[PDB]
């Protein structure tokens, strides 16, 4: 759709759409930028991620409202039909993101910071698919999420310091995967605790600004541990 617009204009307009809180537009502009075929810079990867997280975040919130109403009514077809419509739209957005990662962001990502970033994305969007999955494929979707997160974890442990914000956010979301999707709360708690403690021990190496970035995500791990224990 964005084939006729310059890559740099797409990136500029994604930033404008973020300022305007027009996240559907933002995601379309970043989809167009990815489809130009060039690798993405650190800032550009964040724009891609912020755009789709906002879009699918709104869809997930709507799906949960409608699923709750639907469950209350099972204690006409309209509530189920409308939940299905929202669910289909959500799955389509997740499939679009996964398609961008597979064609061809992940395979061209050689540096640890890009490869871990995209694989965390892959785990997250399969996790969103798993949230609404029921039938023949819920297990395969869950294992796809797990496998992406696991590969990202293995790279992040080898290549990044324990305070790296992408490494910390990956561990946070993998722990949420364990708790909420995989029915493994003990694994979720262990991962969040070990991640927090190894970050704490590395904080002394950081500048004032890096310290702020890392401790912010460490607080999210602690918030989860407080909720889980």
């Amino acid at each position: 759709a964005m084939g006729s617009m310059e890559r740099a204009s797409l990136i500029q307009k994604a930033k404008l759409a973020e300022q305007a809180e027009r996240y559907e537009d933002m995601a379309a502009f970043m989809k167009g930028a990815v489809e130009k075929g060039e690798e993405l810079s650190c800032e550009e990867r964040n724009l891609l991620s912020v755009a789709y997280k906002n879009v699918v975040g709104g869809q997930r919130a709507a799906w949960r409202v409608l699923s709750s109403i639907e469950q209350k009514s099972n204690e006409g077809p309209e509530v189920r039909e409308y939940r299905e419509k929202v669910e289909t739209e959500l799955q389509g957005v997740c499939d679009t993101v996964l398609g961008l990662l597979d064609s061809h962001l992940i395979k061209e990502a050689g540096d640890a910071e890009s490869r871990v970033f995209y694989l965390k994305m892959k785990g997250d969007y399969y996790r969103y698919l798993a949230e609404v999955a029921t039938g023949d494929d819920k297990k395969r979707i869950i294992d796809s999420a797990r496998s992406a997160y696991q590969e990202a974890m293995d790279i992040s442990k080898k290549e990044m310091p324990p305070t790296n914000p992408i490494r910390l956010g990956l561990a946070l979301n993998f722990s949420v995967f364990h708790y909420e999707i995989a029915n493994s709360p003990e694994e979720a708690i262990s991962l969040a605790k070990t991640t927090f403690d190894e970050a704490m021990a590395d904080l002394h190496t950081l500048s004032e600004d890096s310290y702020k970035d890392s401790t912010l995500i460490m607080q999210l791990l602690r918030d989860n541990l407080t909720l889980w224990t």
């Binding site: 964040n46 991620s49 997280k53 997250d124 995500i217 999210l220």
Partner: peptide
């Protein structure tokens, strides 16, 4: 249980 908010950047 909170994942990365990830909604602002």
């Amino acid at each position: 249980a909170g994942s990365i908010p990830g909604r602002r950047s």
